Design a protein around this ligand. Structure first.
Ligand code: ZSW
Ligand code: ZSW
Ligand code: THR
Ligand code: THR
Ligand code: CL
Ligand code: CL
Lengths: 149, 149
C-alpha cells in the first residue's frame, strides 16, 4: 500500500478542489479547478505520478473512472485506475472529515491571500506538516523509503 | 542537505519553465508559466513547500531574491531564501545539462500532448523515474527518510 492513492473532489466558493490522498499516510496534494473534467483529472494525475510513486488510484466517481482522457493519462503514467467504492465503510467518513478539516484551514488562511488557489496550497501545507507524533509528510516518506528497501 | 533546493528558469516555445531541483538527489518539480514574475515564483514555492520539507531555496536570479512577493511566500512557508551564486562552478554546468536533458525529453514527448504544460509534466515524470542504480525519486525519499530518523 505505499503506492495507493484516493481521489476526492470537494467544492468551495463556486470552484472545485481536487484532492489526492495517500491512503496509508493521509498526505495530500490538491489543486483548484473551475470544474471537474476528464482533462483536469488526467492532468492532475500526471503531475502526481511524476512526483510520487503512484501505483493505484481509487478514482472519485464513475465519470472519471470511465473517462478515456483519464484512462489515457493513467496508461501513460503507469497508474492502475480503480474504482473508489467504499467497501470499507470507514473510508467515506475519513474523506468527509478530511474535507471538513481542509475547509476549516482554508477559512483560517482565507484572509492571507486574494485567490482561493493560494489558500488551498496553504491548507495543503498546514495539513501535511501537522503533527498528530509524526506529520503526514513524514509518514509518506517513511512508508515509501521502507518500500524501496 | 535534505532540505536544500535550487530554482531554475528555462525557456521553450515562447514560454517559461520554472524548475525546482532538490540538490542532493536531482529530483525535480516544474511548471510552465507565461513569464517569470514574483507572484508566479511565490506560488510555485508555496506549492513545493507544502509537498516536501523545503528548508532553503537558492533563488534563480536577483529579481526573485529581491521580490517582496517571493520573500512573503518564503516567510509564510518557513523557507530560507538564499542567493544562487555558483560558488562551486560545477553548479552552472549541472543546471545547464539538466535544462538540456529536460528539453530533449520534452521533444521526445512533444507529440503525445497538445499543450506544452502536459509535455513538461511528462518530462518531470521521466526525469524523476530514470534509473541512473536508483532514480532521483528514490534518492530524495531515502535522503529525507534518513533525515527524519
Ligand atoms: C483530450 C485530451 C487532451 N490530450 C489528448 C492528446 C492530444 C494530443 C496527443 C496526445 C493526447 C493524449 O491523449 N495524450 C496522452 C496519451 C496522455 C497525456 C492530453 C491532455 C490531457 C490533459 C491535459 C492536456 C492534454 C494535452 O493534450 O496537452 O493539456 C493540459 C490540460 C490542462 C488541464 C485542463 O486544462 O483541463 O490537461
Ligand atoms: C502580490 C501578491 C499576491 N498576494 C498578496 C497578498 C494579498 C492578500 C493577502 C495576503 C497577501 C500575501 O502577501 N500573502 C502571503 C503572506 C504570501 C502567500 C499573495 C499571492 C501570491 C502569489 C499568488 C497569489 C497570491 C494571492 O494573493 O492569492 O495568487 C495566485 C497566484 C498564482 C500565480 C500567478 O498567477 O502569478 O500566486
Ligand atoms: C521491499 C524491499 N525494499 C525490496 O525491494
Ligand atoms: C536525524 C535523526 N533522525 C534525528 O532527528
Ligand atoms: Cl512536509
Ligand atoms: Cl517517482
Amino acid at each position: 500500500s505505499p503506492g495507493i492513492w484516493q481521489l476526492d473532489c470537494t467544492h468551495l466558493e463556486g470552484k472545485v478542489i481536487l484532492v489526492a490522498v495517500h491512503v496509508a499516510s493521509g498526505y495530500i496534494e490538491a489543486e483548484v479547478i473551475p470544474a471537474e473534467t476528464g482533462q483536469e483529472t488526467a492532468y492532475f494525475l500526471l503531475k502526481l505520478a511524476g512526483r510520487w510513486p503512484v501505483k493505484t488510484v481509487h478514482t472519485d466517481n464513475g465519470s472519471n473512472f470511465t473517462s478515456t482522457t483519464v484512462k489515457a493519462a493513467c496508461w501513460w503514467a503507469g497508474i492502475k485506475q480503480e474504482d473508489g467504492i467504499p467497501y470499507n465503510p470507514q473510508s467515506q467518513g475519513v474523506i468527509e472529515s478530511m474535507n471538513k478539516e481542509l475547509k476549516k484551514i482554508i477559512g483560517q488562511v482565507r484572509d492571507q491571500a486574494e485567490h482561493l488557489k493560494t489558500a488551498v496550497q496553504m491548507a495543503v501545507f498546514i495539513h501535511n506538516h501537522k503533527r498528530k507524533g509524526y506529520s503526514a509528510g513524514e509518514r509518506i516518506v517513511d512508508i515509501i523509503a521502507t518500500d524501496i528497501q
